[PDB]
Design a protein around this ligand. Sequence first.
Ligand code: CLA
Ligand code: CLA
Ligand code: CLA
Ligand code: BCR
Ligand code: SF4
Ligand code: SF4
Ligand code: SF4
Lengths: 138, 42, 95, 139, 80, 161, 739
Amino acid sequence: TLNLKMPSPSFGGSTGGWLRSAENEEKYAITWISKNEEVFEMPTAGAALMRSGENLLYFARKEQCLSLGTQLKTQFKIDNYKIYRVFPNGEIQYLHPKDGVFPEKVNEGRKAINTLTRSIGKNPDPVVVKFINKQTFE
Amino acid sequence: MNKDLLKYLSTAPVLGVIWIAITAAIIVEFNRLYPDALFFPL
Amino acid sequence: FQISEDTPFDANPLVIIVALLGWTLPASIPSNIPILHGTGLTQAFFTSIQSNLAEWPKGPALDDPFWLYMVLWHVGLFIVLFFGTIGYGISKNRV
Amino acid sequence: DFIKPYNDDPFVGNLATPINTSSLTKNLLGNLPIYRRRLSPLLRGLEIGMAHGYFFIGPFYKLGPLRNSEIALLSGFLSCVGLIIFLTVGLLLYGNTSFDKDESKDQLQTSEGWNQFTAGFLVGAIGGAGFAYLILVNL
Amino acid sequence: AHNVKIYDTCIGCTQCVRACPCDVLEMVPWDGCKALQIASAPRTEDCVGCKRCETACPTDFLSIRVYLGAETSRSMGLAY
Amino acid sequence: EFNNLIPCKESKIFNKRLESTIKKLENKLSKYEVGSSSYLAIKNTINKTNNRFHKYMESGVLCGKDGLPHLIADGRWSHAGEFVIPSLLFIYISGWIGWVGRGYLSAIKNTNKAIENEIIIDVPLALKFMSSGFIWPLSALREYTKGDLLMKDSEVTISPR
Amino acid sequence: KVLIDRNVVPTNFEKWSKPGHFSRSLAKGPKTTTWIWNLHADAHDFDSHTNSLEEISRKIFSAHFGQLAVIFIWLSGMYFHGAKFSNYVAWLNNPINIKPSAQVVWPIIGQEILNADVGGGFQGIQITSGLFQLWRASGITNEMQLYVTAIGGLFMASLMLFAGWFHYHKAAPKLEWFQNVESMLNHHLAGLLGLGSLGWTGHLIHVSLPINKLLDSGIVPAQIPLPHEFILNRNLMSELYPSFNKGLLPFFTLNWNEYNDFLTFKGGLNPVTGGLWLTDIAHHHLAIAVIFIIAGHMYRTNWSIGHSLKEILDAHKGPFTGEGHRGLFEILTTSWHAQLAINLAMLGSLSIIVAHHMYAMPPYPYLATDYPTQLSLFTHHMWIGGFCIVGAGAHAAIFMVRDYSPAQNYNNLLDRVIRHRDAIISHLNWVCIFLGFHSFGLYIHNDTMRALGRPQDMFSDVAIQLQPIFAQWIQNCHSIAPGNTAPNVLATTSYVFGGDIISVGNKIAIMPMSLGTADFMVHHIHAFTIHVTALILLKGVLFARNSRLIPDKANLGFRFPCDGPGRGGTCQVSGWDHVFLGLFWMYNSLSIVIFHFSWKMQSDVWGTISSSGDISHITRGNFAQSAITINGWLRDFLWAQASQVIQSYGSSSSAYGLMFLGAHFVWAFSLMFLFSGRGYWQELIESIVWAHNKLKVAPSIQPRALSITQGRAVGVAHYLLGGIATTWAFFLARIIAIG
Ligand code: CLA
Ligand code: CLA
Ligand code: CLA
Ligand SMILES: CC1=C(/C=C/C(C)=C/C=C/C(C)=C/C=C/C=C(C)/C=C/C=C(C)/C=C/C2=C(C)CCCC2(C)C)C(C)(C)CCC1
Ligand code: SF4
Ligand code: SF4
Ligand code: SF4
């Protein structure tokens, strides 16, 4: 579960943050644990102060969360971050890391989606799928 | 003559410029001494 | 009065009074240059106000000294007002 | 000090400044017909119409192609009515596409509410233009 | 959504997964290559179509391919 | 044929061009003192102009109704100097440049400095090839018949079709 | 403290034959033609070569000596051409009736036609650099003095080249030396600017003043004493300026009014030469020298006295601006890009100020009635200014990508700017749309009304007037200031504001410039074009590191083509791409400035006066009625004034005809690069490579199409060269014929 009452980094605010679409379509949350108070760069621009302990931020896009995640990992060696999608109705999907392990590391249990049992040069010609719903890359 | 200097004089732009300048000079000098050759005289 | 969201601001009108007196007094020291006559900028401006109000509807012409007096007088007034507000702000621990 | 996160939320895309959150700003905006409390959509539209119709005649009267004729003001008035009709159709089109069965608790953000507002705007605007004509034709 | 496909010339280097800024991709077990893993695209609803994955892929021709398709708010990268 | 043209020595328009050109130069000449550097410069232009017009007059180049030399490039030998002979000269020189350049490229590919010798020329090697260009037509012809000029179509890369 | 490391870098030619030695990426050598372009593009990007700030600083300092050497060679060349290949002396004797020339062409393939009839028995290219007027003001009266200055220039060049070598290879300063910003400022204010100005005052008083006074009285140059005669024989000076009889006693006793004969406050212009009074110029430089020498005692160096720059900055914070200027001192002592950004912005802005000030207050004798020189100098200095301003944007963006850190900028002014970048850019966007509509829109209104036969409905002086009343009022203040708000000044700073028509020969030097509707309109065009150029560059800087579209943009760097076709398409998001676009708008903006200048001066200022006093302007006052429509600019400016350049074949101006066409060609060729993309070109190259492979003549360095970014760079560089050289040729051909 997320925990909506988790505290946030210290930040004076900006105009780069989320707009109406975050309220009535979807927004994203990233949480992490830091050992110490530390300044980091907001993906919406500006310096913010990481609390020691738990940290919660909301963003409009998944890419903003992951961008921050990459910064946490690279600059601060924090790899305990979690990303969630938050709907207006209150529902919460956990997104990343999906199964506990980062996607770049092989993990048993995962199943191949969107793989093909051929090389790219063995796709059929467009004319063959003319007047049917198939694609050449299906 | 110093081998490193000679290697530098062998680089594409240096040889490029020297060779084009000599070629250009030859054409200039032909036209300075035999001007206005619209055709081969015969 | 709140200058922002939840930020009460003093807005003390003594600043305006002190500023106005602080400028108007020294600006009334007389000068020798032809445009100011033998009076100061304050007097010159006030005289031009009267002379232009004498022609109520007709506004001052371009070439009327009025415009130079008005601008010069206001430049000085606004500088004193500006530093006066900042000074009062320092006293009230705005920083 | 004077600039703060908007609604005490630093991750919302806005800042609280003097221009948007001072007491003067809140006093002005709150009392404008579009925001003011205990107004029907019709009356909101009527007040807005009147204010806009009144000022619309000035440009047409003084700068239009018939400004130097004896009928300058009448041309001014007809131009306003023209402008007002286009704006009303704009309002009709906006309401028609923007609202459906969703009966929101604002009122105005509804099909019926927006139609009352549009009615107001039209009548108010021709009225205000009319009132401006009567002042100018005398004075 | 954009279509992302992984072809059987994949050598399981992981570079596409590392390149992806939207977490569309992941490595799954496989027998087909020495690395004993293949790239997978389980979350193409989050794919923006930036093609950083293809830039990262070392094989010739590519083993990962992005076919740009039906646009959504997600795919267009809108924060409004 | 070429009834619309006339020899430039028979052309009245071509002669008037000389007269008008010189007349302008002599007006320019009158602005300067005899013996001055400026005066001598203008005199050289006058001499050069006269030489040019007289050279064309004595050549048997044809003139249009504009009174300007028009060149015939259909192959007839009475106008060989106007295009055919320049053409042979160009082909001989350009073929040389191409042939010696192709020879150098191939020589360095048979070394460890195949790339280095493209940006830093092996000048002795280059001069050897440049010196050998004078019989490029025969060289190229023999190379063609030996089957050394061209790669086979199956040995050159192509895209899908 | 002087801190140096000795014998750092050996001097040999080893690395000269190792292209791209300076970069890890390039040192491995080419596999592809892309490497050849990368070598050149990365040669002076020193901070990409190494992480060491000390190493970067040393290269820069040494490169600067290299630049100074090049400038001395160029300067030396100008003096030498003056001495050897010019009509300077002839011009000196008769400056009203001789055109300056200091370039002569060799007689090859008929090009000697370019040696124009400039007078003084001389034939050569007419120059527009203003060198002759400069040299006259300096008191140079013969070719020997030019020769010796040329030689001194070659000596200085060699000295700069030695210092560059020495301070890189032999005695390279440590980083701590470069970060002595307080000491640098003290020396550049008091030493470079202060003593420079004092030294020049010395020249002015002892050399320029006497020689020019004798020239202007009508003494023949050859009959004037040499400069040292005035120094050794004080009586020669005292004849011209009697206060020299009193010597230096007035100076030390503060009886400075005694020197009011050679230190003046006249204003206006010398009536003989049409230039500023040299006695005013002398006094200007003395005053400037004093102020600068005082200014250079502000900062603390090796003693207790003076300010810390850091302390000043840290104190300036208020209730609207968080931590204020905290952290800026660290930025400006650790980032060369941050320094370059400021210094380019100011140097560029200054060049533009010089353009305006020099036309209106012509400082040299016989400058004002040398119309080709006036037009050339204004135009040249405007362009230099524009390019520098765009550079400021480039280096501000490079700083944001490479040198900015959040920890250094917590709640300071820089942090707070980027935290409301949407508010800044949205408002600037709006002001640009507003300005565009209410400036250019007025021309379109006018074109439409005039085409429809409704001149009474136009914005014009004789219909709906838009008078620039504020500018008109300022003109009036400046015209009445002498003897009033400036009581001890005798005449206006400039006759452009009002007053007399100054004429030299029968040519107008300077006269009042009336401002009407046409002037109001074109001023708002300038406001518009400058705001848009600012928008593009500011946006580049504020969004260099990230945006809503690309949250990790900084990791992609300053210069990258895009982040792929996704998110709708992301071409040209980088900071570099904002500079690219900003160059076109700077070009657009400055083109209209120089066109405004050219037309306004010809219509309303330049021309002839009769003895009766009847002014005849070059284009006869057509600006007021023609410059208020686009058709008027197309017809009465471009079409009408292009007659000179377009009819130049067969004359000494034929070079300009050729350059005009050539420049149109280069401009059009640029569009091939700007409108296309490399995918097309790389495919075409594949087929061509097939033919080379077939004939066993394919290179081992594989041909590639230019990078996406290089395509853009090549495009804008040809667009600017073609566009600017077209105007150059247009302007020179015209002004040399009629002026
Ligand atoms: C873009 C600038 C521009 C401007 C300023 C003008 C101005 C004018 N045009 Mg021209 N015109 C233009 C461009 C422009 N035109 C272009 C691009 C074309 C296409 C070729 C034309 C073609 C054209 C024709 C065919 C005609 C005109 C005519 C006119 C005149 C009357 C128009 C009118 O009545 O509008 C009505 C104006 C309004 C309804 C409102 C204007 C905007 C208001 C004032 C903004 C106020 C904002 C406010 C400050 C915000 C404060 C908020 C807060 C304090 C509450 C007027 C002089 C007519 C004429 O007779 O000329 C003499 C005419 O017949 N124009
Ligand atoms: C293509 C057809 C078209 C026609 C027939 C007109 C006709 C006119 N335009 Mg032009 N105009 C057009 C296209 C057209 N416009 C376009 C595309 C542009 C943008 C470039 C303009 C820009 C333009 C400007 C800037 C101006 C005009 C003006 C005029 C009027 C000038 C003659 C006059 O003195 O009347 C004097 C005007 C009147 C007596 C008022 C007539 C108002 C009518 C009765 C209102 C009717 C509205 C309509 C029935 C509403 C329903 C339509 C829709 C919602 C279903 C005339 C009515 C001038 C004008 O006076 O406009 C107000 C004017 O200033 N036009
Ligand atoms: C030895 C060098 C060499 C040789 C034998 C060829 C031969 C050929 N080229 Mg290639 N080409 C070359 C260099 C060479 N090229 C270079 C350097 C470029 C880059 C500009 C090209 C770009 C190029 C294009 C775009 C095209 C060709 C084409 C062709 C073919 C037709 C003729 C032509 O259009 O030339 C035109 C080529 C030029 C005008 C480029 C200038 C050639 C330079 C001057 C030669 C350089 C010589 C080299 C530096 C000598 C060093 C030798 C020394 C060290 C010993 C022919 C197979 C065409 C083709 O494919 O037809 C089927 C074609 O479309 N070439
Ligand atoms: C300048 C200024 C400003 C602003 C202003 C404004 C913006 C104004 C506006 C105003 C307006 C804009 C107004 C209006 C008005 C209107 C009116 C007054 C109306 C009336 C009406 C009537 C009376 C009637 C009506 C009617 C009729 C006729 C009948 C039927 C219908 C009806 C009922 C509707 C400010 C404050 C900022 C500041 C100071 C200065
Ligand atoms: S196109 Fe971009 S977002 Fe989509 S899978 Fe590839 S890297 Fe990820
Ligand atoms: S980058 Fe290419 S080869 Fe490597 S894991 Fe991804 S698809 Fe496979
Ligand atoms: S068109 Fe070119 S610049 Fe634009 S996204 Fe595609 S590759 Fe990048």
